[PDB]
Structure formats: structure tokens, C-alpha cells
Amino acid sequence: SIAQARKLVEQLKMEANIDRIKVSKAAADLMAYCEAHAKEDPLLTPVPASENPFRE
Amino acid sequence: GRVYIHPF
Amino acid sequence: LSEEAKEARRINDEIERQLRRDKRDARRELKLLLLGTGESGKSTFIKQMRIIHGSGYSDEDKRGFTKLVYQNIFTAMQAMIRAMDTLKIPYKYEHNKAHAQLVREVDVEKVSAFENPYVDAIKSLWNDPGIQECYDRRREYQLSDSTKYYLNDLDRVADPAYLPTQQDVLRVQVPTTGIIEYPFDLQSVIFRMVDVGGLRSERRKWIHCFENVTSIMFLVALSEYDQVLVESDNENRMEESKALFRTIITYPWFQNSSVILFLNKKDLLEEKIMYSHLVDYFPEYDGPQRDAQAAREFILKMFVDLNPDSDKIIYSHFTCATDTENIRFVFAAVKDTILQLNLKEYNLV
Amino acid sequence: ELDQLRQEAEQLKNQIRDARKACADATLSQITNNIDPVGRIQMRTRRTLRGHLAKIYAMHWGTDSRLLVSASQDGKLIIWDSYTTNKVHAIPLRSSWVMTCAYAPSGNYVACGGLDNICSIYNLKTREGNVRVSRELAGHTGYLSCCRFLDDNQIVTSSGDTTCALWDIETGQQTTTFTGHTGDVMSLSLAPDTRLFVSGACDASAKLWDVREGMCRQTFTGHESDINAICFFPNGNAFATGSDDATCRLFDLRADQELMTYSHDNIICGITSVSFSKSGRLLLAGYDDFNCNVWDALKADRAGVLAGHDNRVSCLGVTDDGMAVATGSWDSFLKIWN
Amino acid sequence: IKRIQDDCPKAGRHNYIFVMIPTLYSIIFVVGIFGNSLVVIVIYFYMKLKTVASVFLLNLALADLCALLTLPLWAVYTAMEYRWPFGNYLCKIASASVSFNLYASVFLLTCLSIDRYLAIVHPMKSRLRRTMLVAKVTCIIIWLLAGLASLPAIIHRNVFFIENTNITVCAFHYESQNSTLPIGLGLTKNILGFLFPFLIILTSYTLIWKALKKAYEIQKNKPRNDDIFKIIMAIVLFFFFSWIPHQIFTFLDVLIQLGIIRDCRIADIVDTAMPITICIAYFNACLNPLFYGFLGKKFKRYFLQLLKYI
């Protein structure tokens, strides 16, 4: 009870100091990664059957 | 002779 | 077909033959889901079936239970000390107060042998009238029903050269935090009794693992109609067991599963209904108020009435903690469960 | 005094919410409004692996992206070759009740666990004849629901006692215990750098843990009902959670906020597994209505449906190279898609 | 077209047979297609062929369906005062189609009788053996054994020209007073078609009867003695009283051929009764979907699901 409360407030005050960057900055980095590696994704762009390790 | 014409 | 592809198919073919053998041998298995209430004699219930179904116990196997025997005597006595604090019952003798602190200090896991300072501590407390009165009020707080058994046998348990008798073995309980299985081989079919009473986690996460079981075994003690437990808001244990029984039946997983409802401790009901009444705990009861058979049938009807399906068959048996026909009843109820399923698929029933 | 501490906790929680409300300039949907849609996704079942006797509960791809291990409740741990559909190993387990499975990155070990509360390590190579149990990691007090190999000598497990642990296989003793959750921990995902890992629990919250220090860094609290699956975005700065709400939610580590929700009115069944593509564009999710759904992770619109399972699809994995997706279901059959 | 003479050509040539019999054949054909085809849908879509019971029940429905397929051919052959306009290749097939499917229908009912006996009288021990593979082997052996019994029919059956009436019939010719090979057709229908199948069916359902009495009395819990025991009596007696008229008149025709019977006054009734007894032998094919199907609770609810989807 009292012990658990002490731990919880310690965890919450420890969790507060992590600085949070804006979503627009974070959302841009998600787009930046998806575009750079879009070509290498085989499921996104189907591979020619010659270089498909499944079904010849 | 006997001609058995029935289905079965 | 290169050289390597040959060995790959040789390994693959060996595995497929082994999987075929295991598939063949799995047709002999039947899974029964065992669901005890907790206070019920679930431990002594299973051990009794293994003794009757051949097997047995040997001195090597027995010596393993010796540590558990001593541990049980402490737990038994320690629960009595905790109740003294709650029911506000003090001790008759001042010497016991000090002895009680020593019993609280003992660690059950650390116990490995029974030493002299602990014999007295426990013997003296059993002698104290306050502890005996607390034992007499065993319905209010969760306590072992076998404490008298061992505490009267303390002299042999105390002796260093001690071997548990088959009766001690039957009563001792081994703690479990996971599933434990008990296989019974009746030659025609091998039963896999799956005991899941000690999972202590959310039931919705693992209940679907037993979706295809043939039957569910429910062990309920008939002597729980007056055992109001004080840990909760003074709730009747019978009501809690009925709630557990109702919840398990309504799961969509067990729609095709039969129910075997064992009613345990019928001998204790006869001894205890003489000075206790059922009507004041269950007002819907209308009986002679002194008959042990009217209460049995009434208690059974309450459980069966909880089943809404009307197509799920419930098989019921009365066990007296020494019945030798428990394994034969399970075989009859499981065989009859299979027969009805065969009839339904043949469109005969 | 108890009220003073809980009021302080309430004040701290208000501050957490206010900080997020501040760093919430624009949603991900607004940023990705002028982007090219993926279109329709056409996947066909290239393979179908058979041999399990009962329901399949977990699978894991090898790092070489050709070998995968699957766990079924019949008591078998089967290692398949995806290309040629040949079984390489068939391990019989001591307890048939298994709920998780893992494959070592080196390819020498496999792990499994379940309602027995024990994680077993099997040595594949160098063991002549039958593979044997190298180790029995014991100490959990609940069913073991996930395990992931950190290295050849470090494995992180999650259990039903609301705690996670980091074990040393050689010694056999847990090194660190991660206990902040208030419900059953059901899933666990490791970061690409193997220094952080997220865990999902039944209290509808996800937490980010630091492996070495052993403390909870951030807590994410967007879901309503219990979380069944979790997976890191390939960049390592985001992860996706699937829950029984029939919705998948994306969270960002730096933003500390929920970005997008992938949900549909027709979908009312729970989500059993989730995984990402190699580029992170496709988010795959297995459902209880017997089929998988493919989502555009940047637009939250459905792109395809992986039908062909007649029972609940319980497990789902994507190869390291991104060539194939393996889904197993309670129908006892694995399928490889491409 | 071989030219022969009919020994007594007025047998079976009555006005009331050329109109009543083709009507019965058509009626059985309409009812049988509606019933049996409905059952095949249910087993494949709802029972899903996951059990040994499904394998046997599917084959029985299939055998009854194929027997009815060639019924319209015989309906118009009897309608035109016994004249065959279809050609030799069609009479070769149409005769084999009836005999092959009818033999399989009788043999399959014997297999269900034995298979039901194992699953009821021995519910525990039969689990080890009653696997899906054994069902497939039994079913193919049944169809193969029916083909070997139907083989004499496809051999002897041939189109003939009756010089006495200038009518082209297709039939079996008993040219000799002994004619041992064609009369092996007569006895095979009698011994391998009624006696052996009925002895097994009678024995198995008698042992099922005893077991259900003992099983229902031990439990004594809400027993439905009425429904289970009515079905067993209905199944066993219907098979006997729907096949015994044809087997009686088949035996008489064997006596006619041997020479024991020579008068055409009763060779007239034998050729008169045979179309009638074939009509009621098909009652099994058009009523098997009821006895072995919808008398149980499972198919009743499956049909209601179909009714909802209209």
C-alpha cells in the first residue's frame, strides 16, 4: 500500500523529465525512413519470378 | 428361350 | 537432385515416420479438465485413485514427503496463531505468547528438519486451550482439516527416524504454480487428468487451451455450507463454488464437453449436520432439519439447476474421502459421454 | 500519508498529459495526406506446411530467412525448411502446453515455454542424434507467454506473474527483473539494437524497458482492453500494438504519444498477432475472424486480406529480408505468402 | 442385332403396366433426386466430412443417387410396350448402371450396420481402430465388390430381335435349359444380395439393441427409449419388407429357367410382378435420406440453416 505508492510516485516523477519532441518532427522521420527503403521492400513491390526464392 | 427383359 | 537433397529427404522421411507413430499413439489419450474449488480434498482425492489403481508407495518415494510433513504441522499451527489476532481470542497461558512469535519466525521453505525447539513450540501451543478453541472455530478461517491427525502423531514426526505412513502421504499437499498432469492407464484408454487449480492468472488467457476436452471434473466439498470465510466480506464458500461452476459451464469452449460433478466429504456432512442447520444458510431449503440425505439431494439440485443448456449431461457422485470407486465412476461417465457423441453423429439420436 | 502520495501521483499524471497535449502539432494522417497510396496487395499461398497434430500457437523465423520453428500443443517443436518444405527437426516437449517459441539469432538454439512456467532451451547443432534440453530456466510464478533470444547467452522472457526477466542461460539464474506492470504480460518485442524492448500487458498499457539498467523508461496508455501483440517499427523509434479492441495503435518513442489507429467498423474480433514489413510501410495483423489484414502504416487504410485459414490465426512473422510472411492458425497448418 | 424367338411372348404385356409403371419410375426419380441430392449438400457443407460417419453416409447417398440416374431410360422403354430405341451401347450401360449402384447400396447399408455396432457396443476400444483411412479402404472395396457382382450383367445383357413380334428388346437370353452362367446372375442377387447382407444387418442391430437396454438402465437419467428403439425397428424391418418381394420373384424366375416351372400361365404373372417389385425396391433409395438422415437432431438444424439462406 504505502510502499507501492512510494514506488509509483518515484516512477511517475522519473518518467516526467524525458523531453518530448513534436509529432511533426517525429512523423517526418517515419516518412523519411519509409521512402528511403521503399525499393528494397519485396512485399511492397513484387519481385520478378526469376529472383523469387519461393515457387521458383 | 426365356427372354428376361426387366431392369434388374 | 544434388547430393545434399538426398540426405535432406532421408531426414525428412525419418521424421514423417515418427510423427505417424505419435499420431497413432495419441488416439489412446483422453483429456479430462480437473477444476477443484480449493477447500475440497483435491489432493487426497487424486492420491486415493492412484493407490486403488495399482501403483503404491516405497520407502525411497516416501522419504521425499518427510520434509512436507513437518512443514504442514507449522502451517497448520501458524494459521491458528494468525486467527488468535483476528478473532480477538487471547491465550490462556502467558508462555504461549513468546512461543507464537517463534512460530511466525519459522520459514516453511527453510525447514529441512524437525528440531527440538520447534517440537515444544508446536506441542505446547496445541496444549494451550486458546489454540484448541481457535481450532474448534475452523470454519471462519482457512485451516487444514488434517491438523488433528498430525498434531496427535507429533511424537513420531518429531523422531529423527520417521517414515510417513501411506495415510500421512495421502494428506500431505505439494504446492504448484503451474499445470500438473496425472496419467491413469485403464488399458482401454489412458486418462490425462489436467489439474489447473493453481494457475493464479487470468483465466481468459489460457482457458481456450482445453477447447476439445471430453469431460470436466468438478470437485466440491459438501461441508462448505457453513464455512463463511473472513478474508472476503463474509461470503459463503458454497456461493463462491456455485459461481465458479456457473462460469465454467457458460464458456463457449466447453459446449461439447460433459461435466462430472464430484461431491466430496459426505461423511463429514453427516457428522456436522447434527449440530448445524442448512435452512438458515439457504432459506429455500425445506427438509427435516436433521436428515443428512435430504441436504445431499438439495445441495446437488442447486448445482444442477445452474446448467441452462439442457443438452449438457452432468454426472454426479458422492465421495467420502475414502471411496474406492472414483476411478470406476470416471470410466463409466466418460464411456457414456463418448457413446452419446457417437449416437449424435450417426443421426440415431 | 496515503492521500498525499496518490494526490501527488494524480498531479504527476496531469503533468504527463499536459506535456503530450503541447507536443501535438499535427497528426500523422495530416502529414501523409499528400502521399501515393500503396494500392491493392495481392498475396498467394506459395507453400503450406503440414504435420502438426493440434493447434499451432507460435512461430519464429530464423535469421537466415529460410528456416522457421513452430510450436503446437500436441507437444511438438518442428523446424521447417521454407524453400523445400522439409522438416529438419521434430523435438518432443516435456509439457505439451506451450504458448511461445523463439529461434536464436545464431541459429543454434530454440526456446519454448507455456503453462508449465518454465522456459526450455534446446541445443540444435553439435548434439549428436536427438537434440537435448540444454537448460531449464525456472523461477517464474505464472505461465510464460513470450521469450526472445537477446544473444546466445541471454534471453528475455515475459510471464503471467506481471513481470519480465532477463536470464543467463549458462548460469541459469535471472540477472534482471522488470516489474512495473499490473496485469498479465502477453507480448514482448526487442529493438534492433537490443538495448530496449517494449512489453504489452493485460492492463491495456505498454512499457519501454532498458535492458541493462532494468527500469521502465516510458509508459503508453492508449488501448482500452488488453494488449495481445506488439512489434517494433524497423527504424526503432516506433512500435505497433494489437489488442482485443480490434484496433492496432502506433506509438512513437520520442513523441511519447499515440500516432494513428488502424480500425474498421466491420472488425469486432480480437487481434492475435502483429508484424511490420522490411520497409515499415505494411503493417500485418492476424485476427480471430480467421484471416489476416494488411494495413498501410502511413494512411491507416486496408490494402489486402490474407484469407485461406478456417480457424483463428494465432501467429504471424515476416522474414528478415522481407521476402515472405508465415502465418499459422489453430487449423494446424502454416502458410508462406509472397 | 441377333434374331431369336421368344418362348412365350405375351407375358407381362398388359395395358395397365405400360402406363402405371412408367409413372412410378418417374415419381421415384423426382423424389429421389430431391432427397438424396439435398443430403449430399448437407454432408459436404455442414458436417464437413471430418468423421467416419460422414464417409459412410456420403457413399450411401451417392449410390442411391446414381441408381436413379438411368431410371427415365427404363421409364420410356416400358412406356413403348417394351421396345428399345436407344441402341446396344446404351442398354450395355443402363443395365450395368442399375445393377452396380443397387449392389453398392445394399453393401453400404451392411457396412453402416457393422460400423454402428462398433461405435455403440464398444465406444472405448473402437477409437484405436475406427480411423479415417480404414473408412476409405472399406468404401473403395465395397464399390469394387459391387462391380464384380454387376459384371455378369454387362456381359450377357444384349439387344435382340424377336421374330415372333418383330420387336427390338434388350434383355438376357436363357437359350439353354440349364444355362449355368446366366443363372449365376439370378442366385447372386438372391444369396449375395439379400441373405448375407440381411444376416449381418439383423445380427448387428440385435446386439445394438441389447447394449442400449443395458446402457439406458444403468444411467436411468432422462432416457429417450422411444426414439432410439423406434428407429432401429423401422430401419431393420423396412429393409426386409422392401426387398423380400423382389427376391421372392427373382427366385421364381430362376425356377422357370431351370425347367422346374414351364407353364406360361404363371410365367405371365412373374413377368407381371417383376416391374412392381422393382418399384418398391427403389423405395429404399428414395427413403434412405429420411431414415439415415433427418430422423436425427443434427440434420434437422442443418436443413433449417439452409431454409434461412433460401
Ligand SMILES: CC(C)CCC[C@@H](C)[C@H]1CC[C@H]2[C@@H]3CC=C4C[C@@H](O)CC[C@]4(C)[C@H]3CC[C@]12C
Ligand atoms: C405395391 C403393393 C401394394 C402391390 C401393388 C400392386 C398394384 C400396383 C397392382 C397389382 C394388381 C394391379 C391391378 C391388376 C389389374 C387391374 C385391372 C385394370 O383394368 C386396371 C388396373 C388394375 C386394377 C391393376 C392396378 C395395379 C395393381 C393393383
Ligand SMILES: CC(C)CCC[C@@H](C)[C@H]1CC[C@H]2[C@@H]3CC=C4C[C@@H](O)CC[C@]4(C)[C@H]3CC[C@]12C
Ligand atoms: C424426400 C425425403 C426422403 C428427403 C427430404 C426430407 C425433408 C424435405 C423433410 C424430412 C424431414 C423433415 C423435417 C422434419 C422435422 C422438422 C422439424 C421442424 O422443427 C422443422 C422442419 C423439419 C426440419 C422438417 C423439415 C423438412 C424435412 C427435413
Ligand SMILES: CC(C)CCC[C@@H](C)[C@H]1CC[C@H]2[C@@H]3CC=C4C[C@@H](O)CC[C@]4(C)[C@H]3CC[C@]12C
Ligand atoms: C471401378 C468401378 C467400377 C468401381 C470402383 C469405383 C471407385 C474407384 C470409386 C467409385 C466411388 C468412389 C468414391 C466416392 C466417394 C468417396 C468419398 C469421397 O470422400 C472420396 C473417396 C470416395 C470413397 C470415392 C473413392 C473412389 C470410388 C470408390
Ligand SMILES: CC(C)CCC[C@@H](C)[C@H]1CC[C@H]2[C@@H]3CC=C4C[C@@H](O)CC[C@]4(C)[C@H]3CC[C@]12C
Ligand atoms: C454381405 C457382404 C458382401 C457385404 C460387404 C461385406 C464386406 C465386403 C465389407 C464389410 C466389412 C468390410 C471390412 C471392414 C473393415 C476392413 C478393414 C480395413 O483395414 C480393410 C477393409 C476391411 C476389411 C473392410 C473390407 C470390406 C468389408 C469386409
Ligand SMILES: CC(C)CCC[C@@H](C)[C@H]1CC[C@H]2[C@@H]3CC=C4C[C@@H](O)CC[C@]4(C)[C@H]3CC[C@]12C
Ligand atoms: C416396404 C413397405 C411395406 C413399408 C414398410 C415399412 C415398415 C416395414 C416400417 C416403416 C415404419 C416402421 C415402424 C416405425 C415405428 C415403429 C414403432 C415401434 O414401437 C415398433 C416398430 C414400428 C411399428 C416400426 C415397424 C416397421 C415399420 C412399420
Ligand SMILES: CC(C)CCC[C@@H](C)[C@H]1CC[C@H]2[C@@H]3CC=C4C[C@@H](O)CC[C@]4(C)[C@H]3CC[C@]12C
Ligand atoms: C408391400 C410389400 C410388403 C409386398 C408387395 C408384394 C407385391 C409387390 C407383389 C406380391 C404379389 C405380386 C402379385 C403377384 C401376382 C399378380 C397377378 C397379376 O395378374 C397382377 C400382378 C400381381 C397382383 C402381382 C402384383 C405385385 C404383387 C402383389
Ligand SMILES: *[C@@H]1O[C@H](CO)[C@@H](O)[C@H](O)[C@H]1NC(C)=O
Ligand atoms: C413380322 O414380320 C414378318 C416378316 O418378316 C411378317 O410376315 C409378320 O406378319 C410380322 N408380324 C408378326 C407378328 O410376325
